[PDB]
Amino acid sequence: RAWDLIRYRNFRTFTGTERIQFNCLAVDPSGEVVCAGSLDNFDIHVWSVQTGQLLDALSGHEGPVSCLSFSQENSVLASASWDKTIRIWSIFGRSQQVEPIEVYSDVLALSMRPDGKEVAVSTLKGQISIFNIEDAKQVGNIDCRKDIISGRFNQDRFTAKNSERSKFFTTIHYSFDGMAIVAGGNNNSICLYDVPNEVLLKRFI
Amino acid sequence: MLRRQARERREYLYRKAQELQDSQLQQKRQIIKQALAQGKPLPKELAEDESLQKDFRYDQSLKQVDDEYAATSGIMDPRIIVTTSRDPSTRLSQFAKEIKLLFPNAVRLNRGNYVMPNLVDACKKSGTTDLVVLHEHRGVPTSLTISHFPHGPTAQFSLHNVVMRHDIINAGNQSEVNPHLIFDNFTTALGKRVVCILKHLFNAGPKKDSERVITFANRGDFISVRQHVYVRTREGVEIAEVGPRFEMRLFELRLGTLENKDADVEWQLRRFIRTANKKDYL
Amino acid sequence: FDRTAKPVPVITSEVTESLEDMIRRRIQDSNFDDLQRRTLALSEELQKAHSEISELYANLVYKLDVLSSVHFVPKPASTSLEIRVETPTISMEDAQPLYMSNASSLAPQEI
Amino acid sequence: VRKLKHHEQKLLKKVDFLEWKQDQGHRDTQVMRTYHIQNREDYHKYNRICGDIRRLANKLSLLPPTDPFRRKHEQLLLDKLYAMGVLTTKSKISDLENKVTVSAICRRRLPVIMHRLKMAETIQDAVKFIEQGHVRVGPNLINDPAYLVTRNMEDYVTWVDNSKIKKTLLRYRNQIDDFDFS
Amino acid sequence: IKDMFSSAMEVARFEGAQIKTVSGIRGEIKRALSKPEGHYRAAFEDKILMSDIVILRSW
Amino acid sequence: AVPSVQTFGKKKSATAVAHVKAGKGLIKVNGSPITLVEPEILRFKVYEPLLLVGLDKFSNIDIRVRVTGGGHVSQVYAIRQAIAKGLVAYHQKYVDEQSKNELKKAFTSYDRTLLIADSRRPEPK
Numbered sequence: 001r002a003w004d005l006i007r008y009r010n011f012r013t014f015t016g017t018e019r020i021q022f023n024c025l026a027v028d029p030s031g032e033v034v035c036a037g038s039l040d041n042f043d044i045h046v047w048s049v050q051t052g053q054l055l056d057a058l059s060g061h062e063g064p065v066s067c068l069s070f071s072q073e074n075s076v077l078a079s080a081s082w083d084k085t086i087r088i089w090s091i092f093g094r095s096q097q098v099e100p101i102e103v104y105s106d107v108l109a110l111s112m113r114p115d116g117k118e119v120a121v122s123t124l125k126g127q128i129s130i131f132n133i134e135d136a137k138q139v140g141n142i143d144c145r146k147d148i149i150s151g152r153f154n155q156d157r158f159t160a161k162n163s164e165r166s167k168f169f170t171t172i173h174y175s176f177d178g179m180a181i182v183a184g185g186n187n188n189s190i191c192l193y194d195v196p197n198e199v200l201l202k203r204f205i
Numbered sequence: 206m207l208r209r210q211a212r213e214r215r216e217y218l219y220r221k222a223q224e225l226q227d228s229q230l231q232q233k234r235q236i237i238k239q240a241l242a243q244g245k246p247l248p249k250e251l252a253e254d255e256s257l258q259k260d261f262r263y264d265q266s267l268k269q270v271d272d273e274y275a276a277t278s279g280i281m282d283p284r285i286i287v288t289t290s291r292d293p294s295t296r297l298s299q300f301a302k303e304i305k306l307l308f309p310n311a312v313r314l315n316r317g318n319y320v321m322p323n324l325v326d327a328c329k330k331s332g333t334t335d336l337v338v339l340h341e342h343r344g345v346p347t348s349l350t351i352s353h354f355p356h357g358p359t360a361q362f363s364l365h366n367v368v369m370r371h372d373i374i375n376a377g378n379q380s381e382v383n384p385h386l387i388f389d390n391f392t393t394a395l396g397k398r399v400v401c402i403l404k405h406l407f408n409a410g411p412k413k414d415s416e417r418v419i420t421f422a423n424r425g426d427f428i429s430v431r432q433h434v435y436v437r438t439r440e441g442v443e444i445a446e447v448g449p450r451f452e453m454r455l456f457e458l459r460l461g462t463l464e465n466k467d468a469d470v471e472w473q474l475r476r477f478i479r480t481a482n483k484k485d486y487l
Numbered sequence: 488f489d490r491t492a493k494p495v496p497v498i499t500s501e502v503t504e505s506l507e508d509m510i511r512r513r514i515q516d517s518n519f520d521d522l523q524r525r526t527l528a529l530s531e532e533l534q535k536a537h538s539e540i541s542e543l544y545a546n547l548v549y550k551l552d553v554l555s556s557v558h559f560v561p562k563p564a565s566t567s568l569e570i571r572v573e574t575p576t577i578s579m580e581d582a583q584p585l586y587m588s589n590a591s592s593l594a595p596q597e598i
Numbered sequence: 599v600r601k602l603k604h605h606e607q608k609l610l611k612k613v614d615f616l617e618w619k620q621d622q623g624h625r626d627t628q629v630m631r632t633y634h635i636q637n638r639e640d641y642h643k644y645n646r647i648c649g650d651i652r653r654l655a656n657k658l659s660l661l662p663p664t665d666p667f668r669r670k671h672e673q674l675l676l677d678k679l680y681a682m683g684v685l686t687t688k689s690k691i692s693d694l695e696n697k698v699t700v701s702a703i704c705r706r707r708l709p710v711i712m713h714r715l716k717m718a719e720t721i722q723d724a725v726k727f728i729e730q731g732h733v734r735v736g737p738n739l740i741n742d743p744a745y746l747v748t749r750n751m752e753d754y755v756t757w758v759d760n761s762k763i764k765k766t767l768l769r770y771r772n773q774i775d776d777f778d779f780s
Numbered sequence: 781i782k783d784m785f786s787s788a789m790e791v792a793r794f795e796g797a798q799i800k801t802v803s804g805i806r807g808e809i810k811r812a813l814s815k816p817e818g819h820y821r822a823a824f825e826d827k828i829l830m831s832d833i834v835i836l837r838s839w
Numbered sequence: 840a841v842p843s844v845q846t847f848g849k850k851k852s853a854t855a856v857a858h859v860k861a862g863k864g865l866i867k868v869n870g871s872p873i874t875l876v877e878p879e880i881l882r883f884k885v886y887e888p889l890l891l892v893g894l895d896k897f898s899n900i901d902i903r904v905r906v907t908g909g910g911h912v913s914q915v916y917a918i919r920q921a922i923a924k925g926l927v928a929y930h931q932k933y934v935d936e937q938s939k940n941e942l943k944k945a946f947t948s949y950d951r952t953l954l955i956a957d958s959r960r961p962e963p964k
Contacts, residue, residue: 006588008579019561059332062206102955143940158731164758165739209753223687263692265663279525327961365495387513388520410524420510435514442515477806477825488838491798491808540657554746560681776844777928
């Protein structure tokens, strides 16, 4: 659903064809296009803001779309599957071309630098990788499986050291400087990784 | 996806094989509705059932395209792929483009060193309605299959009398607008399968005054397809022909895709039978 | 001897004159096949049956989605009219001694 | 008690300490064994829902048959009760009163699904692997044995990664890859 | 199948003919094989042997 | 017992099963040293996981690699993949972690195809 903040009202309630759940969302900075993603369908639906029709069903993922986000620079968007592959889309103006970038395990909760040139990922192995967009290669990756504090629940039967509940990161957001990542998951801890020096700065319980 | 796409087939079978055992219960609930409406007598094995009696009190509120095409039928446009066999001759590589032009929403991907698994499996992924693959003998194209992708059926067609469009003259180029269709002489229930498997290769809802019409005619068990444009004069319609002439003949019909090669065979042209030449749609 | 198949029929001009004169009959009459798009109180006792039974169903959906660990398959169709009242739109937000929006809720085009 | 005699019998034609009409055949125990469910009150926590299906089925049977509410409303419901997967087929409208059983809803349990998908060998052994923490749904591992799993979500159960039980499987096919640290 | 027809033209007078075998399988004879003058390809319903003797009924 | 780590390497249809165990510093391919790989121009395409990170880190380990399938070239892309994966999955197991992220950042900046299989799955336009 769209909303106004001047008037507090829906513009239009965008819906799919066959009534799918929607996890996540990505909005064109020039507010023309709203993209959303599922668990049921694994097709990236694309709505226009003016006409409430869906413009296109961008597809090509095995497994669901975790997150979606747009460049603020050139407005390519990049999806984040669970078939271990970032797939970067280019949807504007007679191109309709696709580039997949394979990663090691299931990715979730992407985010893009305000440069519009780098994409930060949070895979299920814990590790956060930083890719380029104009090239498919990666700048570097930073290792997050060790510096995550994990709780033992009350009803558990395993040590807190070797449970695989919480050692990944279900979110990431670049700072607007483009130099730091804050990550947070189903764990007890939040992190502040430096991006060039590739070392965390401080860990928050 | 690969595990999801498999398991929807398994449940579609169990939803289909449930209907065959419930077709008998589908039949008997007609008798209860009519005898409640008009007519006293009621048959013996339907009399002694107390199961079906209590069952009917819910069942009184119940009520055509094929079951594979049922979810999409009018809603989503098809997107189809015309692709060629393996190292094609330059005659048939033209002829795949007339198939690419005869349908709307058709792209031509040249095939070479693809396997039929990784061309199917990299097409269910990208999401297409179906797949058109051709074959040839010495430049004359002979065979043709349409195979609906989300575990849908396939239909291997043999096509005999072809006239490629590039032979004739530089008369121009086709209309490429949404066609009307003409299906003639389809009476058989297997004939209605070939209706509903060919019809969904065209984009839904053509305009009332679009100018090109594609006839699929079935005189003498050879489905004969021609491409026509028409204009309407002060008295009569006057037509002219563009595009290919086919004769065409289906000869086997799997329920899986053309990948599968061990799927259930709905129909299969038996040649070697004492009454093979007698029947029609056999 | 005995054959085994009616062979490939030879396309004479007589066949086509039987065929293109069929097409003129179906164009001019405009009866031809095409894939058409898919489109899209009563009683005082019966309404109270309808009102009880929808209050029970919304209780059921709340229970069934909690079992299913919220992952909810959506309702297929929904069409509804609603009526909005023009208020200065500090009055549509929660009780708090500030505001973000000052104008009326109805747009100037809509009045 | 005693295998009481023949003259003891006729005075005690009705007494029995183990089997009562209140107790209703011990159906609740009899299906707690077949599906191995942990706490006792779990049955009647389902059998309150599975009864509440039929009470909505009944009053929706008391509406007249050519009512576009009623025709819309149970087909609205069979969409949900099939997506959740408690009932096998979507066609019959009288599955909703006859096939909605607790043993139907108690086999979309997680350990039954791990036995249906041939993950664990038996159904007790699947509870043993859930409680020890080897199984997961998508990102997060699941630890309650009694996790209901949607037929849609039934695609996504796997062994939790780097586990000692997903490592042993890959050794059988001689296909480990410790760059995954499987 | 060899030495039933003498020339490649003789086969063309007889194509489409419902050939049968001793073993009882049916078939048809389809095209005159060229590079030897006599033989022809014939599609049966199942795999013919080498030990087997095709016979075409005629009047 | 014996500390080992098994990693795979895959190009066109060629597998590469690289057992890596603590040892003396021999590196075999199909029961033959790595200085005897067939195509003789692409021998430095498999010296890349040796020479990128530095030849000191092979002083304590064994690299037994056996390959099947593929051609002449598409096996050389499999042994350079399974030696890179077999080296960088032994430092996360039996040697230090900070070695591994030094290696995984070394093979990355040179050529990422050493680690993850560049799968050229088709695309329909």
